[PDB]
Amino acid sequence: SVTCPGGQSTSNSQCCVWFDVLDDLQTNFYQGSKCESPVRKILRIVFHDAIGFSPALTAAGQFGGGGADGSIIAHSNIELAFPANGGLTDTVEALRAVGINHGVSFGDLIQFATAVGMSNCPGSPRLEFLTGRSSSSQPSPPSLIPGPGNTVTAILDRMGDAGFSPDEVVDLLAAHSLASQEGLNSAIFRSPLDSTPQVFDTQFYIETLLKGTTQPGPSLGFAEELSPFPGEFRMRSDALLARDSRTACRWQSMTSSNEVMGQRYRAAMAKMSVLGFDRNALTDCSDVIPSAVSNNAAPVIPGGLTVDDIEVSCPSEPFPEIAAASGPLPALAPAP
Ligand code: HEM
Ligand SMILES: [Ca+2]
């Protein structure tokens, strides 16, 4: 172990510069360690940066992308042009300054900002953090980011190419437990994906499984589906993945335990963080990441709706027992 200049203890000397980054991010980028939009935007950024990786393209004789190389920042002029990266400009520019001021690679910074950002949201597990990703990168090839307009097969094949199994795709989606949409239906700006956009819990999995009965906005978006109550938005891909026979059972098992959800998401994230890199060549600085406040609330079926309102899509396995909250039907306020 080593004692950094600031007095912080750590396992490797290269972890020291990250305590300075931490203080910078928590005070400015996260405006006081808050769990709001900046956290949600960073989670989109980490996924979009990392997923630009394709062994299949490489085999075909084309550049497949360098994975979690920070290319979304270094080559933002190109990547921010992709329609899948809309609404990320201001966040990318803010992160660029931090990386330059502290002399850290953008690949590492994105991964670090993700771990730190989630510690600001109750219920979040403590994500692993590795440092050492090269600072140089090439822009990601286009069309590598799965979208809400893609079929389930198209999403599984894209993710599978990158190295993810169908169940790991479900595990990664736990991030939609801290989510809203701004560009799918601008009429209802920041309508949340689950009833607790500031709590990393299983509500996302439970609520997407409820029968869709409500149109939250004036019209139904291009990639929107009816949701369970006013104010909540339901993305087409999320609704389909929860019901598809290839992903249904895993989705169903993610409803009953915040504990289990957290572990799987953390393992899946660790895998995504090294796409395009060799983990053995990186240094572990996970001890710099703070713990998030605990979430003691139990999972519930909200609004007086019961388990009978769930569209069980994996009947071959028992549907777990989940608490039920009395009515009335809630009306969600936009995510902060
Ligand atoms: C595997 C298929 C996935 C699809 C098709 C998908 C699609 C989308 C779309 C279209 C939005 C709304 C963006 C906007 O209008 O603001 C969104 C939001 C969001 N997604 Fe995903 N997503 C996927 C996975 C993920 C993953 C793997 C992560 C990260 C670990 C992630 C994190 C988020 C978050 C936190 C938001 C909220 C952003 C906000 O409130 O500003 N998503 N996603
Ligand atoms: Ca990248």
Ligand SMILES: [Ca+2]
């Ligand atoms: Ca939530």
